[PDB]
Amino acid sequence: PVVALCNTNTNPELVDFIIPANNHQPQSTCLLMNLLADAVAEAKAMPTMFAYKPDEEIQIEIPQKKQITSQRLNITRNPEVLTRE
Amino acid sequence: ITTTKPIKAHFDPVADLLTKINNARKAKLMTVTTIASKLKIAILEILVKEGYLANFQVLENKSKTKRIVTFNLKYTQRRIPSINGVKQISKPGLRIYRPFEKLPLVLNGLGIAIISTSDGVMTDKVARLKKIGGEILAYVW
Amino acid sequence: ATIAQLIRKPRKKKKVKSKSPALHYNLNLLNKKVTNVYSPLKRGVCTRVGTMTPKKPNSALRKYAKVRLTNGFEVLTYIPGEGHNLQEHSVTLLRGGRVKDLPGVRYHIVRGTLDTVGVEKRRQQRSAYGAKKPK
RNA sequence: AUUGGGCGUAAAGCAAGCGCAGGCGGAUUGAAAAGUCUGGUGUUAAAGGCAGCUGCUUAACAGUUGUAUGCAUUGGAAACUAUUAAUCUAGAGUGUGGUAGGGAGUUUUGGAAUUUCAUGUGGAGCGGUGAAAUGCGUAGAUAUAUGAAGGAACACCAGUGGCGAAGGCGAAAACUUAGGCCAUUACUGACGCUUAGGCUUGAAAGUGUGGGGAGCAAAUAGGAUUAGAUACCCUAGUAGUCCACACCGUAAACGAUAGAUACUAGCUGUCGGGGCGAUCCCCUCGGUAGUGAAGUUAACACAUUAAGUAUCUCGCCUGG
RNA sequence: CUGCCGAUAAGGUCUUCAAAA
Ligand SMILES: [Mg+2]
Ligand SMILES: [Mg+2]
Ligand SMILES: [Mg+2]
Ligand SMILES: [Mg+2]
Ligand SMILES: [Mg+2]
Ligand SMILES: [Mg+2]
Ligand SMILES: [Mg+2]
Ligand SMILES: [Mg+2]
Ligand SMILES: [Mg+2]
Ligand SMILES: [Mg+2]
Ligand SMILES: [Mg+2]
Ligand SMILES: [Mg+2]
Ligand SMILES: [Mg+2]
Ligand SMILES: [Mg+2]
Ligand SMILES: [Mg+2]
Ligand SMILES: [Mg+2]
Ligand SMILES: [Mg+2]
Ligand SMILES: [Mg+2]
């Protein structure tokens, strides 16, 4: 079994437990990644981090380095494969 | 029920439906549309009795001058169809007429053979029961 | 192709040709016409004995013969064996075959049958070369 | 290879088009019953065929009973095809309204550039090559400035482009003219696809007659190179390349992929019509490209413009 | 940075084998 956070560009056949989500945002990823970790920690009998939790304890910050921009650009770095004769 | 696209169909009436079914199965599509004819309507009725398609609805225009049948395929929960392969026998040009003694059995009865003898389209088993044969439209298994 | 196309021009089968054509021609002599009647083996008369060289891999001296059969066809027939009594003018009873070394030769002389002698000093596979059982 | 094969790169899609006969062919209603199915009767000589049995010591064999196939006639079935009598518009056309084009022919017009000639200035080479030599030049060449004559082809625009069935089409204008795309509350009402035979067009070379000839150059002459050079290089150079009218009908005439019809993920461009109204960009309907999964292929690869799932028709292939 | 630069007699080995350890 393999679970994954597909982000609209993945073949759904390969994954089993698909989890529709983002993958480019340093906030969505962490929330979801901790959530799976949270299941494991509860099964292992250690306290949870994000799951089954109110607003004040789920709050997370946006890493450094208006709204956040989840735009895919840098298309100019895809020219035609060198050809011609 | 309303549409948005123009509906066209081929001139040959058995393989037109057959192409629609085969393309939808391979492309995993479910709902398709085509023009409605009485031969095409009758073959779809026996198909749903045999349990190869789920629903089959024939419709007419608001003027009563055109009819188009829009059928859907019967996919299981895991999304694999019930139809495995379709092949037409009595193609245009060469029409196939076989007597009762030579009525074919498709995949030892697993598939169904469409035979329109004298009372419209008719399955192979019931054709054998009445001991009467005739035009053979297509093989479906 | 198409049902209509084949109805107009049906499927014509490819022909079949023999490997020993000269053995299936019979000349009547009273009318001088040649009919095509198959015959296993035929009698002829030799015209020129000698030797030929094989194609490429093989290297040797193989004894050929230009024998004219009871018909009017001249065929080069290999004398299959070690040693021959052919004397340029003689009668032979040719059979079918095709030696691969010499190009053009497509017949063999049945040994030890008519004027041609048998192949003595042979104890193996004699029934084919024609030698009396040592006994 | 009807059952039972193929035509991009292995044999095989005619160069393309207009197309009669033939084949195939939208939907609904009525009749007939030619195909189609079925019942009855007649017949399909005997031997042989298959099954069972008997008789030869069993067998081979002989006899014995059974055992189909087709044709005709008669009585029914009416789903499909064919025939006939009619209705409908969705296929295909026509008209109105938008509209893009190097689509074609005929007749005129224009400027650079080359060559030749005319007139000045000028004074020793120019030209050509790997290096040179034929060749041109004190009869003043090359060069420079002006002018005249003549023929051929139409820089830039010019394209990750447009048009035509193909060959092909690119300076400007006039006349004549072909097809195409989009929207149609209009009209006819299956009039449609393919096409043996037939007809039309068809790059360049070539032919016949009459013009034209600036440049270039098969054939030819000379100088080089070379062991030799009838070739690659150079200097000359006729037919030809050009026009009008008559033929020839072949090309790697290639997308090496016949035409028509319906369906099958998506993404990025670009062109035209339409909808909105600065462009730009969004949507719809089409043409032309790239990438790309299912699918196909021997592999390369094709992939909504198929070589994919299927049907119709024509042409073609059967080892070297 | 384009000179020049042509030829090479015939036929031939070599994989025995996995039954298995
Ligand atoms: Mg083959
Ligand atoms: Mg070929
Ligand atoms: Mg072609
Ligand atoms: Mg060809
Ligand atoms: Mg046409
Ligand atoms: Mg016709
Ligand atoms: Mg019909
Ligand atoms: Mg009989
Ligand atoms: Mg007998
Ligand atoms: Mg001048
Ligand atoms: Mg020409
Ligand atoms: Mg000379
Ligand atoms: Mg010259
Ligand atoms: Mg000439
Ligand atoms: Mg040709
Ligand atoms: Mg590709
Ligand atoms: Mg041959
Ligand atoms: Mg040298």
Curated annotation (Swiss-Prot), chain A:
Domain of life: Bacteria
Signal peptide (from-to): none
Family that this chain belongs to: Belongs to the universal ribosomal protein uS2 family.
Protein name: Small ribosomal subunit protein uS2
Taxonomic classification: Bacteria, Bacillati, Mycoplasmatota, Mycoplasmoidales, Mycoplasmoidaceae
Name of encoding gene: rpsB
Part of the whole protein covered: 197 to 294 of 294
From Swiss-Prot, chain B:
GO MF annotations, alphabetized: rRNA binding; structural constituent of ribosome
PROSITE patterns with a match to the protein in the record: RIBOSOMAL_S8 (PS00053)
Keyword RNA-binding among record annotations: yes
Gene Ontology annotations for the cellular component aspect, listed alphabetically: ribonucleoprotein complex; ribosome
Disulphide connectivity of cysteines: none
This protein's record includes keyword Metal-binding: no
Protein function: One of the primary rRNA binding proteins, it binds directly to 16S rRNA central domain where it helps coordinate assembly of the platform of the 30S subunit.
Alphabetized NCBIfam families for the sequence: PRK00136.1 (NF001109)
Complex formation: Part of the 30S ribosomal subunit. Contacts proteins S5 and S12.
Designated name of the protein: Small ribosomal subunit protein uS8
Gene: rpsH
Swiss-Prot record, chain C:
Record GO cellular component, one term: small ribosomal subunit
Keyword Membrane assigned: no
Gene3D superfamilies, per the entry: Nucleic acid-binding proteins
Biological processes, Gene Ontology terms: translation
UniProt keyword Kinase present: no
One term of GO molecular function: rRNA binding
Transmembrane segments: none
Function per UniProt: With S4 and S5 plays an important role in translational accuracy.
Protein name, per record: Small ribosomal subunit protein uS12
Organism, as annotated: Mycoplasma pneumoniae (strain ATCC 29342 / M129 / Subtype 1) (Mycoplasmoides pneumoniae)
Gene (name only): rpsL
